[PDB]
Design a protein around this nucleic acid. Sequence first.
RNA 1: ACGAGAACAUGCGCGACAUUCCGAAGAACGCUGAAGCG
Length: 54
Amino acid sequence: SLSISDSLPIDPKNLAIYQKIDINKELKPMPLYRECVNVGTTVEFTMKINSDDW
RNA sequence: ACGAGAACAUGCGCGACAUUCCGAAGAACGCUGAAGCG
């Protein structure tokens, strides 16, 4: 009953590389860099559900 | 010097005519590219 559409395409301006920092009671730089959507971005999906189940 | 002697169970003729192997039917149901962080 739950359906999620794929998102509307994300503008490339909203993509940037971030570095992941593990925190085991202290910040620790690590060889993690990933392409991520920058904060403040709005993403649009279309959701269809039935009244009975959800 | 046989109820006998001759004497083709034969001739012309199509197993043929009319016919949809179709009718109904979602290859889809569920499923985070993610977990640990050395």
